[PDB]
C-alpha cells in the first residue's frame, strides 16, 4: 500500500494534463449512504470501511461526506489510511480491519486506532505496547464463527477456547468489540453462523468477566447488513455497498468512472496487424483511435479484442492486446470522432454504460481487483452537483 | 498514470509503517546496463526507456545510475515521468515513446521533450504549439513498417505516403528522428521488416529533403537490439532488459523484489474453511500465517491456492483466495516461523526464489502487468552495495 496519500486533490487543469483519470461521484456516494441508512435499525452504528484508500476512490476526497453524514466509526487497513482519516478532522472511532504487524501497530499510536486481534501473541504484544505508551489500548477480538479462517481465533476446540479467554483477559488492554466476518453471500449460512457467534461471544464475555454494555458486537459486511437484518447487532461494517459494488444489491450504482482521451486517429489499410503478438488484423480499411492508457494504468492486457469503450456516445471495440501505456480502438464506423474527445473505459457516457459484468468478464478479474489499482495509479477528480 | 512522481525516497524509519514494499537492486540494475552495453556496436547509442515510472522501479531512485552510465537519451510516457527525469538532473535527449494528447504536449513544453508523431493532425498541432511558444520543436516520426499499428504512419499505400510527407514537411518543426517498433520476438520477421523500414525511411527523407546526417534512425527494443544486431542503427530503445524482464534473454536478472511480513500465526483445526468463497478447507490441524498484503497491493486474487511465498528460507503455500488487504499462508510444516519475519512474494530469499514463470502462471498475467502496478501501489526501497 502507498506510504502516504497525496494531500492535494487534483484540480481541472491537472486533469487536462493527465493521460487517464478517475471521476468520483460525490452525489452518488451520498445517495448510496442515505439508501443504506434507510435499511438500518435506528440504533445500529455504522462503521464506514475505507480500506485501500476508500476502495480506490480516495479517503481525502470522501471524508467530508462521511463527517457530514455523522458516521461515528471508520475502518482502515494501512497506517497511511489511518493518518489520512485523522488529517480530515475525523474525531470518531477508528478501527483496523485486518491483522497488522507489531511494527505497524507501534508506529500508529498517535492515531488512536483500535486494533483487531485473533491470537495470544497479538494480545501479549499490544499489552506490552500499552505498558510502554502509558495508554490503555482498545482492541476488537476477532472470532472465527464466520469461517473466514483469517484474522480470528477459532474456538471449536478446547485449546482455541482457552486461547480466546487468554486474548480477552490481558492487562492494560480494553476489549471494546467482539466480531466475526462472513465469506459467502448465503442468507441461510449467515443465519446459522450468526447463532454460533452469539453463543461464542456470550461464552467469551462470561469467561473473561467482560461487561456487555462496554462491548460492541459486530459481524455484518455490506451483504450481511442488507440481506440478513438480524445480524446488524450493535454495529455494521459496510464498505463495497457505499461505493456501489455489492453484486447482490445492484440498487447502489458505482461511484467511479475511469476515463482517458483520444490522442490521435490513424488510417490503416486492410490486412494490417495491431499490437504485440499481432493478435488482430484489419479486414478493411480502418480508422483507429490511439488512447494513452494501458495496463500500467490498470486497463488490463486481456481487454484487447474483447472490451468496448465509449467515444462520442458510441461503443467502440478495443483491438490488439493492450500495451503498457497505449490502447488502440476501432472507430471506423463511429461518427464524429476527433482527437481530444473523452473516452469512458468504465462508467457511463450519454446513454451507454460499460457494466461491471463486462469489466469482470473481459478482464477475468473481480471488480475490486480493478478499481483498487485504478486508484493507486491514476488521479481522482471529485464531482458534485448543486442547484443553480 | 500518477499526476506526480513523489519527490522523496522512503527512509529506513518509513519501512516500519509499510505493510508491503518493493526492494530495488541498484547493483543488479548497473550490471544489466553494463552487460547490455557489451553487445552494442560502436556507432549506436542508448536511449533508456523509463515509462511507467521506470517499469515500476522508480525514476527518481534509478536516474543517478542512468547518469553515471553516460546514457545520452531517456524515453518516457507521461508528463509526470518527464518531470521526474528532468528533476533528477538529466540533461540529455528526452523522448516520448507514445502518442500524447494536445493538452499533454502543451503542458510539457518546459521539459524539452521530443514528441512521437504518426499523423498529420499531430504535426499540425505541434507546429501551432511551436508558433505560440516562440520555438522550433523537435520531433520523431513513427513509421508502421514493424506492423504495430499503434503510434505510426502506415506507408504501404499512396494515402499513407502522402500523409507521411505532410508530417515531415511541417514548418516551425525539426525532424530529429525516424523510427518503427516490432510486435514479435521473431528474428526473421524483424529482419524482413527492418529492410522495409530502411526503404521507407530513405524514401521519406528524400521526398521531404531531410539530411540523413541530422536524423537518428531507431527501431530496436530490448529483444531486437540483442537478437538482431544489424537493427541497432543510430540508437536503440531498451526498456525491459535493463530491469531484467526480457524473456528471450534470461541472462538479465530482475531488479525487483516484492516483500511483506508475517503479522500473526493462527491455529486452525482440520476441516476449517479459509477466505472468501471458502475455496480451501484444511485437511489437517494447521498453523496459518496472516500476511498484510492483498490484491489492492498488487498481489492478485488468483494467487490463492496456487502460489507459494518464501518465509524463513522455506516455500509456503498460499491458501484461500487473496483478500483485498490480507493473504493467508500454510506454515504448518515450516520451521522457525515467527511474527515479524520477512516474506518474499517475488524474488529471492536464501537459496529459494519465486520465478517469473510462477508469477505469470499463478496470476494469469504477463510479468509487467504485475510489476508496473506494484510500483504505483507500494513504496520502493533502494539497495546499494559498497
Ligand atoms: C473484516 C471486514 N469487515 C468489513 C469489510 C467490508 O466488506 P464489504 O465491502 O463486503 O462490505 C471488509 C472489507 C472486511 O475485511
Ligand atoms: C516505442 C517503444 N520503444 C521501446 C520500448 C521498450 O520496449 P522493451 O521493454 O521490450 O525493451 C517500448 C516500451 C516502446 O513502446
Ligand atoms: Cl476476519
Ligand atoms: Cl509504435
Author numbering:
A (entry chain B): 24 to 411
B (entry chain A): 24 to 409
Pull text from the paper.
In a previous study, we reported the three-dimensional structure of BsrV and defined a molecular fingerprint of conserved residues that define the family of broad-spectrum racemases. Compared to Ala-R, BsrV’s capacity to accommodate amino acid substrates other than Ala capitalizes on its broader entry channel and active site. We discovered that contrary to Vibrio cholerae alanine racemase AlrV highly compacted active site, BsrV’s is broader and can be occupied by cell wall stem peptides. Using a BsrV-His variant, we observed that the hexahistidine affinity tag was fully stabilized in BsrV’s entry channel. Based on these data, we proposed that BsrV might interact with the cell wall muropeptides. Using in vitro biochemical and structural analyses, we demonstrated that peptidoglycan peptide moieties bind and inhibit BsrV activity. Interestingly, edited muropeptides containing NCDAAs (produced by BsrV) showed stronger binding and inhibitory properties compared to those ending in D-Ala (canonical muropeptides), suggesting that BsrV activity is controlled via a negative feedback loop by the degree of NCDAA cell wall editing. Taking these biochemical and structural data together, we propose that inhibition of BsrV by peptidoglycan peptides underlies a negative regulatory mechanism to avoid excessive NCDAA production.
